[PDB]
RNA sequence: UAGGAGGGCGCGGCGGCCGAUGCAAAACCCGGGGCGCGAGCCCGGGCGGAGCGGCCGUCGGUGCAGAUCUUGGUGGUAGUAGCAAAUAUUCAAAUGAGAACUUUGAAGGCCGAAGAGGAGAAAGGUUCCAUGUGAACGGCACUUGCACAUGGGUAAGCCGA
RNA sequence: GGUGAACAGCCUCUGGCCAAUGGAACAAUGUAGGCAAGGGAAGUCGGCAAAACGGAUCCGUAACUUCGGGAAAAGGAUUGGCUCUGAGGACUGACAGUCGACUC
RNA sequence: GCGACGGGGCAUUGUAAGUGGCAGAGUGGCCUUGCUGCCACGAUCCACUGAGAUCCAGUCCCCGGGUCGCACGGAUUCGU
RNA sequence: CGACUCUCGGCAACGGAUAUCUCGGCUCUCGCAUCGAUGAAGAACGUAGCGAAAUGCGAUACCUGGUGUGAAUUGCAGAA
């Protein structure tokens, strides 16, 4: 809602910083196995439950 | 050359409905370069963007009716 | 080869029995089929005034006859499937009506 | 009816986030966490769910302080 | 048949013996040749690219066709059932590799205001706005988007708490 | 806004849309919606479904009754358009003047 | 010859728009009228008018009556 | 001759069996005894030139200091 608490606004902010594709240079490091962000979230597909 | 950003901001600047905005069909490129409420107001002044007049709903037939019920 | 001719199209017999929500849309299609057979042109362009005429009585009342002129012209546009195109437009008509009008050729 | 018509009426939260454990298990009306038992001083845990125990024992977090006690025990807790 | 016993075949380790292999091991493939009543076995050809086998003793999570068996993969069904509520679209032009589906203009219609209009509470959480975009996704399609990528955006002594 | 007793239904203005995959054709069988001569429930477990009635004004209304009802019982007549006629008012100085939206 | 128009036949509905009317219940105004006055409003009525509109789309006829426009087809295959 | 169906072989797909592995697991044995109001375990939010997760850390924030070692870190860039 537009009326929210600071604590809920704080957690929603962090969830946004985590919806980003991995940097390209991570894919180049020695002995690397990360392919993609396996935790990306879409607001219409998976709800935060908080 | 979609002019969605311009059909909107014409309704808002002219303070009318989006169905009452006329963007000139022969200069879409000048309209398409204006990307601002300032730039839209300039096109308003130049006659490139007008306000279509309201559709007609006359009460003559109601007035004649009420003037025969007397 | 450029030619401009005047036609009367009997839209009544073409649309006889057509569903109401389709008649004036099907009137456009029969104008287009008419011109293709009229000029041997698989490219027919209908003028906006002719479109206005066909829609004037809404979607289910279409003029029973129409006088149009069809003008065969050149695709001067280098990029085109075919050499020629047609321009079908509305045509002014005498006070005698459609009485006695065959296919006239425009000067 | 039950089913689709009745599922449309979820609008009110029975649980919200808990300050002590962070899970959406704080029952607002009852005012206690169903997971950790807050505000009870002791933590809610049972031996009939060993799996729930191991999800939240020591070592599943940082051990901000107890990480270094092994190193301090060696060298018998020297103070400079 | 139920059932009992004997003698064999096969799988994986351990103690011993005897050996093969980058001059090509294992596994797998074959209308290749053979051996054995059979379980199985030996060789040929190919593929592969680094391990493997026989004999004696001993040991075991040791042999599948079934259990509406477990997990995974795959068919026929079948280009089939189907894509049919909420009245509806049409003409030019622009754009573009590509336009029934994008954009502008014109026309024809609908909601008809206890609305298909304008704003909120809950709930959501960036969906808001600009720019761009290969795939996927938007149960046809798309130049497009509530998708994807990069940025931007929420201002209070008086509205609230 | 109009019709109207009416936030009914129906049409319109402000604002919003034409988003529901398209094209061709118009077999059976469906589904949704109509109409049918003569007869009129014979159909069927059963009038199920449909049809008939329906607004308003005037008239008239039985049994029975807890005397409040039944009752909109039942049963009749009327209803457009146009051109008129009468009644019902206000204020200002049994009158004079001006004004006046509405009903019958 | 075909196709499109168009003309005629045949049929359905039921007398179009416009014009005029000393048609019309009545009602206002103005003349020195005087009535068989002049202006204005007026559902409907009358004549022009068995009119007008429609008529194959699965109706009929059209060679002297008419206005037109047409291809010299592309493509695939077959030996008893 | 053909189409379709079935079938044999060769090649190509589909799928991930088999073989060969293994910074993982399981089992046995041994040593030791060390959380917290001096704020623990756990939770949250931050933190890197370029980072989301994991790992690390706390506004001194993928670290400061001492000591040992003795010339790198590394995906790119830069002070060196
Ligand atoms: Mg949902
Ligand atoms: Mg029909
Ligand atoms: Mg229940
Ligand atoms: Mg409730
Ligand atoms: Mg509750
Ligand atoms: Mg074993
Ligand atoms: Mg077993
Ligand atoms: Mg099996
Ligand atoms: Mg068996
Ligand atoms: Mg189908
Ligand atoms: Mg269906
Ligand atoms: Mg209301
Ligand atoms: Mg948007
Ligand atoms: Mg799609
Ligand atoms: Mg009224
Ligand atoms: Mg109403
Ligand atoms: Mg009958
Ligand atoms: Mg009966
Ligand atoms: Mg009977
Ligand atoms: Mg019977
Ligand atoms: Mg019976
Ligand atoms: Mg019934
Ligand atoms: Mg009764
Ligand atoms: Mg007439
Ligand atoms: Mg007549």
Short mmCIF file of N, CA, C and O (backbone and C1' of nucleotides) in Angstrom, two decimals, chain H residues 6-29:
data_model
loop_
_atom_site.label_atom_id
_atom_site.label_comp_id
_atom_site.label_asym_id
_atom_site.label_seq_id
_atom_site.Cartn_x
_atom_site.Cartn_y
_atom_site.Cartn_z
P C H 6 3.86 -48.63 -39.86
"O5'" C H 6 4.38 -50.12 -40.05
"C5'" C H 6 3.72 -51.21 -39.43
"C4'" C H 6 4.29 -52.52 -39.91
"C3'" C H 6 5.80 -52.67 -39.81
"O3'" C H 6 6.21 -53.05 -38.52
"C1'" C H 6 5.07 -53.38 -41.95
P U H 7 7.62 -52.56 -37.92
"O5'" U H 7 8.71 -53.33 -38.80
"C5'" U H 7 8.84 -54.73 -38.70
"C4'" U H 7 9.63 -55.30 -39.84
"C3'" U H 7 11.07 -54.85 -39.94
"O3'" U H 7 11.92 -55.54 -39.05
"C1'" U H 7 10.05 -54.77 -42.08
P C H 8 13.11 -54.77 -38.30
"O5'" C H 8 14.37 -55.05 -39.23
"C5'" C H 8 14.67 -56.36 -39.68
"C4'" C H 8 15.74 -56.33 -40.74
"C3'" C H 8 16.79 -55.25 -40.59
"O3'" C H 8 17.80 -55.58 -39.65
"C1'" C H 8 16.03 -55.30 -42.82
P G H 9 18.55 -54.43 -38.82
"O5'" G H 9 19.57 -53.81 -39.87
"C5'" G H 9 20.53 -54.61 -40.51
"C4'" G H 9 21.19 -53.87 -41.64
"C3'" G H 9 21.75 -52.51 -41.29
"O3'" G H 9 23.00 -52.59 -40.65
"C1'" G H 9 20.54 -52.36 -43.30
P G H 10 23.52 -51.38 -39.74
"O5'" G H 10 23.84 -50.23 -40.79
"C5'" G H 10 24.96 -50.32 -41.66
"C4'" G H 10 25.08 -49.09 -42.52
"C3'" G H 10 25.10 -47.75 -41.79
"O3'" G H 10 26.37 -47.41 -41.27
"C1'" G H 10 23.55 -47.65 -43.56
P C H 11 26.47 -46.59 -39.90
"O5'" C H 11 25.97 -45.13 -40.28
"C5'" C H 11 26.74 -44.28 -41.11
"C4'" C H 11 25.94 -43.12 -41.63
"C3'" C H 11 25.44 -42.12 -40.61
"O3'" C H 11 26.43 -41.22 -40.16
"C1'" C H 11 23.70 -42.65 -42.07
P A H 12 26.39 -40.69 -38.65
"O5'" A H 12 25.15 -39.70 -38.63
"C5'" A H 12 25.12 -38.55 -39.47
"C4'" A H 12 23.77 -37.90 -39.47
"C3'" A H 12 23.23 -37.49 -38.11
"O3'" A H 12 23.77 -36.25 -37.67
"C1'" A H 12 21.55 -38.62 -39.31
P A H 13 23.57 -35.75 -36.16
"O5'" A H 13 22.00 -35.72 -35.96
"C5'" A H 13 21.42 -35.32 -34.74
"C4'" A H 13 19.93 -35.43 -34.81
"C3'" A H 13 19.19 -35.44 -33.49
"O3'" A H 13 18.96 -34.13 -33.02
"C1'" A H 13 18.37 -37.16 -34.89
P C H 14 19.13 -33.76 -31.47
"O5'" C H 14 18.07 -34.68 -30.75
"C5'" C H 14 16.68 -34.40 -30.80
"C4'" C H 14 15.91 -35.44 -30.05
"C3'" C H 14 16.37 -35.67 -28.63
"O3'" C H 14 15.71 -34.81 -27.73
"C1'" C H 14 16.17 -37.74 -29.77
P G H 15 16.46 -34.22 -26.44
"O5'" G H 15 16.66 -35.48 -25.49
"C5'" G H 15 15.58 -36.26 -25.01
"C4'" G H 15 16.09 -37.51 -24.32
"C3'" G H 15 17.21 -37.28 -23.32
"O3'" G H 15 16.73 -36.98 -22.03
"C1'" G H 15 17.83 -38.99 -24.83
P G H 16 17.66 -36.25 -20.96
"O5'" G H 16 18.69 -37.36 -20.50
"C5'" G H 16 18.28 -38.51 -19.77
"C4'" G H 16 19.30 -39.62 -19.86
"C3'" G H 16 20.49 -39.49 -18.91
"O3'" G H 16 20.99 -40.80 -18.62
"C1'" G H 16 21.27 -39.40 -21.11
P A H 17 21.90 -41.08 -17.33
"O5'" A H 17 22.11 -42.65 -17.37
"C5'" A H 17 21.03 -43.55 -17.22
"C4'" A H 17 21.26 -44.83 -17.96
"C3'" A H 17 22.60 -45.50 -17.71
"O3'" A H 17 22.64 -46.27 -16.53
"C1'" A H 17 22.20 -45.40 -20.02
P U H 18 23.96 -46.26 -15.63
"O5'" U H 18 25.06 -46.94 -16.55
"C5'" U H 18 24.92 -48.28 -17.00
"C4'" U H 18 25.96 -48.62 -18.03
"C3'" U H 18 27.41 -48.39 -17.62
"O3'" U H 18 27.93 -49.44 -16.82
"C1'" U H 18 27.06 -47.45 -19.74
P A H 19 28.83 -49.11 -15.54
"O5'" A H 19 30.25 -48.73 -16.15
"C5'" A H 19 30.98 -49.65 -16.93
"C4'" A H 19 32.08 -48.98 -17.71
"C3'" A H 19 33.08 -48.18 -16.91
"O3'" A H 19 34.06 -49.00 -16.30
"C1'" A H 19 32.42 -46.95 -18.81
P U H 20 34.53 -48.75 -14.79
"O5'" U H 20 35.66 -47.66 -14.92
"C5'" U H 20 36.56 -47.67 -16.01
"C4'" U H 20 37.11 -46.29 -16.24
"C3'" U H 20 37.35 -45.46 -15.00
"O3'" U H 20 38.54 -45.80 -14.33
"C1'" U H 20 36.25 -44.15 -16.62
P C H 21 38.73 -45.39 -12.79
"O5'" C H 21 38.81 -43.81 -12.82
"C5'" C H 21 38.76 -43.04 -11.63
"C4'" C H 21 38.37 -41.63 -11.96
"C3'" C H 21 38.22 -40.67 -10.79
"O3'" C H 21 39.47 -40.07 -10.49
"C1'" C H 21 36.46 -40.38 -12.40
P U H 22 40.02 -39.92 -8.99
"O5'" U H 22 39.09 -38.83 -8.33
"C5'" U H 22 38.91 -37.56 -8.93
"C4'" U H 22 37.83 -36.78 -8.25
"C3'" U H 22 37.78 -36.94 -6.73
"O3'" U H 22 37.50 -35.69 -6.14
"C1'" U H 22 35.67 -37.41 -7.65
P C H 23 38.69 -34.80 -5.55
"O5'" C H 23 38.06 -34.17 -4.24
"C5'" C H 23 38.69 -34.29 -2.98
"C4'" C H 23 38.44 -33.08 -2.13
"C3'" C H 23 36.99 -32.62 -2.07
"O3'" C H 23 36.74 -32.03 -0.80
"C1'" C H 23 38.32 -30.90 -2.99
P G H 24 35.93 -32.83 0.32
"O5'" G H 24 34.53 -33.11 -0.36
"C5'" G H 24 33.39 -32.33 -0.06
"C4'" G H 24 32.13 -33.08 -0.37
"C3'" G H 24 31.72 -34.14 0.63
"O3'" G H 24 31.10 -33.63 1.79
"C1'" G H 24 31.59 -35.04 -1.52
P G H 25 31.42 -34.29 3.22
"O5'" G H 25 30.39 -35.48 3.35
"C5'" G H 25 29.03 -35.31 3.00
"C4'" G H 25 28.41 -36.63 2.62
"C3'" G H 25 28.42 -37.71 3.67
"O3'" G H 25 27.39 -37.55 4.63
"C1'" G H 25 29.12 -38.62 1.62
P C H 26 27.66 -37.86 6.17
"O5'" C H 26 27.77 -39.44 6.23
"C5'" C H 26 26.65 -40.27 5.97
"C4'" C H 26 27.06 -41.71 5.89
"C3'" C H 26 27.77 -42.26 7.10
"O3'" C H 26 26.88 -42.63 8.14
"C1'" C H 26 28.97 -42.86 5.17
P U H 27 27.34 -42.54 9.66
"O5'" U H 27 28.39 -43.72 9.80
"C5'" U H 27 27.99 -45.07 9.77
"C4'" U H 27 29.18 -45.98 9.85
"C3'" U H 27 30.12 -45.72 11.01
"O3'" U H 27 29.68 -46.28 12.22
"C1'" U H 27 31.38 -45.90 9.03
P C H 28 30.05 -45.57 13.60
"O5'" C H 28 31.47 -46.17 13.96
"C5'" C H 28 31.74 -47.55 13.79
"C4'" C H 28 33.22 -47.80 13.77
"C3'" C H 28 34.03 -47.08 14.82
"O3'" C H 28 33.93 -47.63 16.12
"C1'" C H 28 35.11 -46.86 12.75
P U H 29 34.19 -46.69 17.40
"O5'" U H 29 35.72 -46.32 17.30
"C5'" U H 29 36.72 -47.31 17.45
"C4'" U H 29 38.09 -46.71 17.30
"C3'" U H 29 38.39 -45.53 18.20
"O3'" U H 29 38.72 -45.88 19.53
"C1'" U H 29 39.04 -45.00 16.01
#
